[PDB]
Ligand binder design. Structure first.
Ligand SMILES: Nc1ncnc2c1ncn2[C@H]1C[C@H](O)[C@@H](COP(=O)(O)OP(=O)(O)OP(=O)(O)O)O1
Ligand SMILES: [Ca+2]
Ligand SMILES: [Ca+2]
Ligand SMILES: [Cl-]
Ligand SMILES: [Cl-]
Ligand SMILES: [Cl-]
Ligand SMILES: [Cl-]
Ligand code: NA
Ligand code: NA
Ligand code: NA
Ligand code: NA
Length: 326
DNA sequence: GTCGG
DNA sequence: GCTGATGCGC
DNA sequence: CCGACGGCGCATCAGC
């Protein structure tokens, strides 16, 4: 793509700062910069040009001049050659191993996939599952498969209670031809901001999906959020489908629109929408949009009857899901 | 790392 | 058990 | 020119 060399470079720097440096604000700075550059409609030809964009400052502008002049960045060349950094970065690819766990593993001499398998006893349950399906979770999911997955989830939810509504969100809802995983937003009329009239609404759905062997493992699970693993059924003598990551959020039925806005993403789109909201004097989460007071305290939830309502409050033109991708 | 209080 | 902090993740 | 940057669920640990 246009400016892909530059946005690749900045994404790699972002990942180095989060995973190795543990500098989460530099991670965010690089991600914002990558994002704005990715949506910039001209081929960037100097650092000075790039510096005019919001989120690009002096330091990223120098890097862009170096990349443009040379087709590489010396900082990144040195990072790539650093075995310890590469091992730390690599270990974070495992679900359940973040930057802190990865550094401790590498410090203890665990630097490779083989090292992890020989040291399963040092891993928690989440990390064990992450390791077990490491190869599978690196793969993306074709939209054709996401459609078969949607069909199974929606059917099984219907069988538990026809009053449930399940909506497949994330990249899928944004129209992507492939997805990293499956995110399902769940609502039921017995769960609203005003009451919990039935117990175990999420649990009921999870156990039915387990019963039919669609959900195969659990990474975490509470009353509102399930994080786990699932798999499509496959035909005789045919290779198995990869195991996939699945997340299910149960949101109060009356907060559906803030819910689907959040769960539709992208992640960068949400953080920029929420930042804009803040400077328009609002705070947004997956439940509500509320006005900000002088103390800093959030007011009461504002009425919302559509995704577009949320955009209107902060004076954004509506963006369809497909225009919320990076 | 960037931008603003 | 709790509150608060951290780690991991959406 | 130093300090703030979306927002939150679940799991685990520290210090009660
Ligand atoms: N840091 C964050 N802040 C706000 N919202 C987030 C954040 N991370 C994830 N989300 C929201 C937006 C995401 O689209 C949604 C589902 O997350 P996730 O599955 O991780 O990514 P995704 O569906 O956008 O892309 P992918 O195809 O890689 O899964 O949750
Ligand atoms: Ca997803
Ligand atoms: Ca997800
Ligand atoms: Cl930082
Ligand atoms: Cl479970
Ligand atoms: Cl809503
Ligand atoms: Cl709220
Ligand atoms: Na700038
Ligand atoms: Na990880
Ligand atoms: Na169907
Ligand atoms: Na199996």
């Amino acid at each position: 793509t246009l400016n892909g060399g530059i946005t690749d470079m900045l994404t790699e720097l972002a990942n180095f700062e989060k995973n190795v440096s543990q500098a989460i604000h530099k991670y965010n700075a690089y991600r914002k910069a990558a994002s704005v550059i990715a949506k910039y409609p001209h081929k960037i030809k100097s650092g000075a040009e790039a510096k005019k964009l919001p989120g690009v400052g002096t330091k990223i502008a120098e890097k862009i001049d170096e990349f443009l002049a040379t087709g590489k960045l010396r900082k990144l060349e040195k990072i790539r050659q650093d075995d310890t950094s590469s091992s730390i970065n690599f270990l974070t690819r495992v679900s359940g191993i973040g930057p802190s766990a990865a550094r401790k593993f590498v410090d203890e001499g665990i630097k490779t996939l083989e090292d992890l398998r020989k040291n399963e006893d040092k891993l928690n349950h989440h990390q064990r599952i992450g390791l077990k399906y490491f190869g599978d979770f690196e793969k993306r999911i074709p939209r054709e498969e996401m459609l078969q997955m949607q069909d199974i989830v929606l059917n099984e939810v219907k069988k538990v209670d026809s009053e449930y509504i399940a909506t497949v969100c994330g990249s899928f809802r944004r129209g992507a031809e492939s997805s990293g995983d499956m995110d399902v937003l769940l609502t039921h009329p017995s769960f609203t901001s005003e009451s919990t009239k039935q117990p175990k609404l999420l649990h009921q759905v999870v156990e039915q999906l387990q019963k039919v062997h669609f959900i195969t493992d659990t990474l975490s699970k509470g009353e509102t959020k399930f994080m786990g693993v699932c798999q499509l059924p496959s035909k005789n003598d045919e290779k198995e489908y990869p195991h996939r990551r699945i997340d299910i959020r149960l949101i109060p039925k009356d907060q559906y629109y803030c819910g689907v806005l959040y769960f539709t993403g992208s992640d960068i789109f949400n953080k920029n929408m929420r930042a804009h909201a803040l400077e328009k004097g609002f705070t947004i989460n997956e439940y509500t949009i509320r006005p900000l007071g002088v103390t800093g305290v959030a007011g009461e939830p504002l009425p919302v009857d559509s995704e577009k309502d949320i955009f209107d409050y902060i004076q954004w033109k509506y963006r369809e899901p497909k225009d919320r991708s990076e």
